[PDB]
Amino acid sequence: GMTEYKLVVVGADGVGKSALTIQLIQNHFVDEYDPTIEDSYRKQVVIDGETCLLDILDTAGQEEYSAMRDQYMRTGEGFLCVFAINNTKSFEDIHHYREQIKRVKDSEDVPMVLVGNKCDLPSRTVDTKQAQDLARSYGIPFIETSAKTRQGVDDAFYTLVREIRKHKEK
Numbered sequence: 001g002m003t004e005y006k007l008v009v010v011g012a013d014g015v016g017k018s019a020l021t022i023q024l025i026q027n028h029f030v031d032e033y034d035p036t037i038e039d040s041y042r043k044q045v046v047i048d049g050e051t052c053l054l055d056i057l058d059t060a061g062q063e064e065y066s067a068m069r070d071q072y073m074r075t076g077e078g079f080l081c082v083f084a085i086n087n088t089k090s091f092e093d094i095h096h097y098r099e100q101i102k103r104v105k106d107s108e109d110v111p112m113v114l115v116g117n118k119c120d121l122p123s124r125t126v127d128t129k130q131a132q133d134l135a136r137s138y139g140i141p142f143i144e145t146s147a148k149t150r151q152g153v154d155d156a157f158y159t160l161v162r163e164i165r166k167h168k169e170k
């Protein structure tokens with residue numbers, strides 16, 4: 001049998017949620033992917049010897065707080081909270097995404113990873129120290145990624161799976 005892990009990728013428009021997801025799944029950088037499309041993708045992977053199925057929701061569209069949207073998000077087992085290292089506003093939004101996750105999951109202990117994407121770019125407006133401090137304040141890992149080169153991408157998604165696997169053992 002394969003366990004399926006339901007992962008949700010969230011964060012501001014333009015941070016690279018779609019590029020990270022497509023890079024993970026298909027091993028190619030899709031630049032300029034339609035910002036308005038929300039979809040899910042699956043991949044069979046081996047993580048620490050466990051053959052499992054990732055089901056990844058790449059979020060997009062309108063911010064909305066209906067009971068149905070909350071219930072859909074509540075089915076997520078772990079969340080990648082993504083900002084772009086050259087967009088301070090996307091980093092400032094992270095606290096809001098974490099607050100919504102904690103609210104629908106009714107817990108401060110939700111499997112989560114803070115992802116600083118676009119690390120292939122030389123110009124970084126978000127301080128690495130500030131991002132590490134924010135992740136420490138939430139008790140979650142911080143991983144830098146590039147959806148273009150694939151640097152850190154497997155680590156971000158596999159770390160989130162490891163967190164879900166551990167959470168299910170509590």
Ligand SMILES: N#Cc1c(N)sc2c(F)ccc(-c3c(C(F)(F)F)cc4c(N5C[C@H]6CC[C@@H](C5)N6)nc(OC[C@@]56CCCN5C[C@H](F)C6)nc4c3F)c12
Pocket residue numbers: 010011012013059060061062063064065066069070073074093096097100101102104
């Ligand atoms: N909804 C909703 C949610 C539930 N009902 S539950 C639940 C959860 F558990 C986790 C995450 C979310 C979630 C999502 C979801 F993941 F659902 F797609 C999309 C958001 C979204 N999108 C709109 C745009 C930007 C990215 C993409 C999706 N297109 N934007 C914002 O905030 C945007 C800002 C700027 C303007 C005012 N707001 C408050 C802060 F200032 C930040 N939050 C979003 C969000 F929290 C939700």
Ligand SMILES: Nc1nc2c(ncn2[C@@H]2O[C@H](COP(=O)(O)OP(=O)(O)O)[C@@H](O)[C@H]2O)c(=O)[nH]1
Pocket residue numbers: 011012013014015016017018019020030031032033034035117118119120121145146147148149
């Ligand atoms: N250089 C660089 N550009 C990226 C990276 N990830 C995404 N982009 C670009 O950033 C823009 C937004 O990416 P997208 O995946 O659409 O972001 P989303 O709105 O969060 O889904 C696009 O023009 C991408 O090609 C990355 O790691 N490096």
Ligand SMILES: [Mg+2]
Pocket residue numbers: 017018019033034035036037058059060
């Ligand atoms: Mg997208």
